[PDB]
Design a protein around this motif. Structure first.
Motif, PDB file in Angstrom:
ATOM      1  N   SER A   1       0.828  -1.197   0.000  1.00  0.00           N
ATOM      2  CA  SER A   1       0.000   0.000   0.000  1.00  0.00           C
ATOM      3  C   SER A   1       0.864   1.249   0.000  1.00  0.00           C
ATOM      4  O   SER A   1       0.606   2.195  -0.754  1.00  0.00           O
ATOM      5  N   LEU A   2       1.898   1.269   0.840  1.00  0.00           N
ATOM      6  CA  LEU A   2       2.793   2.419   0.858  1.00  0.00           C
ATOM      7  C   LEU A   2       3.490   2.581  -0.483  1.00  0.00           C
ATOM      8  O   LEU A   2       3.645   3.703  -0.979  1.00  0.00           O
ATOM      9  N   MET A   3       3.922   1.474  -1.085  1.00  0.00           N
ATOM     10  CA  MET A   3       4.554   1.569  -2.396  1.00  0.00           C
ATOM     11  C   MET A   3       3.593   2.154  -3.420  1.00  0.00           C
ATOM     12  O   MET A   3       3.973   3.019  -4.218  1.00  0.00           O
ATOM     13  N   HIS A   4       2.340   1.704  -3.407  1.00  0.00           N
ATOM     14  CA  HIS A   4       1.358   2.225  -4.349  1.00  0.00           C
ATOM     15  C   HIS A   4       1.132   3.713  -4.127  1.00  0.00           C
ATOM     16  O   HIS A   4       1.021   4.486  -5.087  1.00  0.00           O
ATOM     17  N   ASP A   5       1.062   4.135  -2.864  1.00  0.00           N
ATOM     18  CA  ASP A   5       0.852   5.547  -2.571  1.00  0.00           C
ATOM     19  C   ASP A   5       2.018   6.387  -3.066  1.00  0.00           C
ATOM     20  O   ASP A   5       1.821   7.460  -3.652  1.00  0.00           O
ATOM     21  N   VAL A   6       3.243   5.921  -2.831  1.00  0.00           N
ATOM     22  CA  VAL A   6       4.406   6.673  -3.286  1.00  0.00           C
ATOM     23  C   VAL A   6       4.427   6.731  -4.805  1.00  0.00           C
ATOM     24  O   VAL A   6       4.792   7.752  -5.398  1.00  0.00           O
ATOM     25  N   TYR A   7       4.034   5.640  -5.460  1.00  0.00           N
ATOM     26  CA  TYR A   7       3.957   5.652  -6.915  1.00  0.00           C
ATOM     27  C   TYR A   7       2.954   6.689  -7.397  1.00  0.00           C
ATOM     28  O   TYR A   7       3.222   7.431  -8.350  1.00  0.00           O
ATOM     29  N   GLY A   8       1.789   6.752  -6.756  1.00  0.00           N
ATOM     30  CA  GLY A   8       0.803   7.748  -7.140  1.00  0.00           C
ATOM     31  C   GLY A   8       1.313   9.163  -6.952  1.00  0.00           C
ATOM     32  O   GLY A   8       1.098  10.034  -7.801  1.00  0.00           O
ATOM     33  N   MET A   9       1.995   9.414  -5.835  1.00  0.00           N
ATOM     34  CA  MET A   9       2.551  10.744  -5.609  1.00  0.00           C
ATOM     35  C   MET A   9       3.608  11.082  -6.651  1.00  0.00           C
ATOM     36  O   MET A   9       3.690  12.225  -7.117  1.00  0.00           O
ATOM     37  N   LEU A  10       4.431  10.102  -7.028  1.00  0.00           N
ATOM     38  CA  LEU A  10       5.420  10.347  -8.071  1.00  0.00           C
ATOM     39  C   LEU A  10       4.745  10.680  -9.391  1.00  0.00           C
ATOM     40  O   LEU A  10       5.189  11.578 -10.114  1.00  0.00           O
ATOM     41  N   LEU A  11       3.668   9.970  -9.723  1.00  0.00           N
ATOM     42  CA  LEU A  11       2.934  10.293 -10.942  1.00  0.00           C
ATOM     43  C   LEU A  11       2.381  11.710 -10.886  1.00  0.00           C
ATOM     44  O   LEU A  11       2.455  12.456 -11.872  1.00  0.00           O
ATOM     45  N   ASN A  12       1.818  12.099  -9.742  1.00  0.00           N
ATOM     46  CA  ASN A  12       1.258  13.440  -9.618  1.00  0.00           C
ATOM     47  C   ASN A  12       2.335  14.503  -9.795  1.00  0.00           C
ATOM     48  O   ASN A  12       2.138  15.496 -10.509  1.00  0.00           O
ATOM     49  N   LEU A  13       3.484  14.313  -9.146  1.00  0.00           N
ATOM     50  CA  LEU A  13       4.563  15.285  -9.279  1.00  0.00           C
ATOM     51  C   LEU A  13       5.086  15.334 -10.706  1.00  0.00           C
ATOM     52  O   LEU A  13       5.407  16.412 -11.219  1.00  0.00           O
ATOM     53  N   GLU A  14       5.184  14.179 -11.365  1.00  0.00           N
ATOM     54  CA  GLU A  14       5.617  14.172 -12.757  1.00  0.00           C
ATOM     55  C   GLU A  14       4.647  14.952 -13.632  1.00  0.00           C
ATOM     56  O   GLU A  14       5.067  15.721 -14.503  1.00  0.00           O
TER      57      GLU A  14
END
Lengths: 111, 85
Positions: free
Chosen positions: A91-104
């Motif tokens: 879950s934490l990995m998925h959340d960090v991935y989503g945040m990375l997508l948003n920042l990108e």
């Protein structure tokens, strides 16, 4: 189980009221620290390990969460990533991935 | 019975005899003459020659295939495009 934990919660509250009565302290304002002091006094133990000594805490702090069964009474696991085996980690990995997508899309002090 | 100095002759450029000799030796190796000389120092029996040639061909083809596979799959070494997953 959850019902067991609720029963332990009620029992701990009743024991807290017992302790407050025994020490003469207002149960309403009787706090965890006061409980700690009173239990330490009433059960003098000379063990070096803070864990080996007695304890009377809330069930939340006392018991290990033991991952909370993860499946309700019906048997459906609560976490969508449950079958991974590391549900919180993924879950934490998925959340960090989503945040990375948003920042990108948009674009010596610590460790 | 041939003309002299036309075969396996290299003119030294500006006197760099070292470079000229290296070029000549490269020519000899490329044409395999050194192979022939050092193999003919002794007699390889026909069975041994056949086995050696078969082994050399197999190794050449195996090496060519391995190199082609490595070149083909090298492109995937690029940094992970889905890191964190």
């Amino acid at each position: 189980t959850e019902d067991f934990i609720k029963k332990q919660i009620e029992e701990f509250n009743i024991g807290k009221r017992h302790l407050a009565n025994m020490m003469g302290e207002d149960p309403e304002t009787f706090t965890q620290e006061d409980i700690d002091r009173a239990i330490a006094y009433l059960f003098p133990s000379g063990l070096f390990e803070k864990r080996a000594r007695p304890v009377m805490k809330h069930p939340e702090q006392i018991f290990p969460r033991q991952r909370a069964i993860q499946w309700g009474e019906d048997g459906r696991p609560f976490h969508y990533l449950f079958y991974t085996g590391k549900q919180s980690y993924y879950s934490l990995m998925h959340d960090v991935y989503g945040m990375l997508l948003n920042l990108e899309k948009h674009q010596i002090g610590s460790r | 019975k041939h003309l002299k100095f036309i075969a396996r002759t290299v003119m030294v450029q500006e006197g760099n005899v070292e470079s000229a000799y290296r070029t000549l030796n490269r020519i000899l190796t490329m044409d395999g003459l050194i192979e022939d000389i050092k193999h003919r120092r002794y007699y390889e029996k026909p069975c041994r020659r056949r086995q050696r040639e078969s082994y050399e061909r197999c190794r050449r083809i195996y090496n060519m295939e391995m190199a082609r596979k490595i070149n083909f799959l090298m492109r995937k070494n690029r940094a992970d495009p889905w890191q964190g997953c």
